[PDB]
Each structure stands twice: as structure tokens, then as C-alpha cells.
Design a protein around this ligand. Sequence first.
Ligand code: I6W
Ligand code: I77
Ligand code: PYJ
Ligand code: PXY
Length: 9
Amino acid sequence: LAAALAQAL
Ligand SMILES: *C(=O)c1ccc(-c2ccc(C(=O)OCC)cn2)nc1
Ligand SMILES: *NNC(=O)c1ccc(-c2ccc(C(N)=O)cn2)nc1
Ligand SMILES: CCc1ccccc1
Ligand SMILES: Cc1ccc(C)cc1
């Protein structure tokens, strides 16, 4: 989940 968001950055 963290990675799913972190792709934005
Ligand atoms: C949420 O974005 C997210 C994405 C990916 C993963 C994740 C966890 C573990 C592995 C892995 O290769 O584990 C080897 C033990 C890969 N990706 N977790 C949360
Ligand atoms: N928000 N995330 C990024 O901007 C981001 C872009 C690209 C990468 C990345 C990581 C690792 C490789 C590689 N070939 O090992 C390439 N690009 N990370 C984050
Ligand atoms: C969008 C500005 C920025 C860039 C990279 C990381 C954080 C913030
Ligand atoms: C999804 C992601 C992976 C690595 C960095 C450094 C940033 C984002």
C-alpha cells in the first residue's frame, strides 16, 4: 500500500 502511493513521488 505505501508503495502504491509512493509512486506519486
Ligand atoms: C503497497 O503498496 C505494497 C506494495 C508491495 C508490497 C510488497 C511487499 C513484499 C514484497 C516482496 O517481494 O516480499 C518478499 C518477502 C513485494 N511487495 N507491499 C505493500
Ligand atoms: N515517485 N517516484 C519516482 O519518482 C521514482 C521514479 C523512478 C524510480 C526508479 C527506481 C529504481 C529504478 C531502477 N532501475 O532500479 C528506476 N527508477 N523510483 C522512484
Ligand atoms: C513536487 C515537488 C517535490 C518533488 C519531489 C519530492 C517532493 C516534492
Ligand atoms: C515507489 C518508489 C520507490 C522508490 C523511491 C525512492 C520512491 C518511490
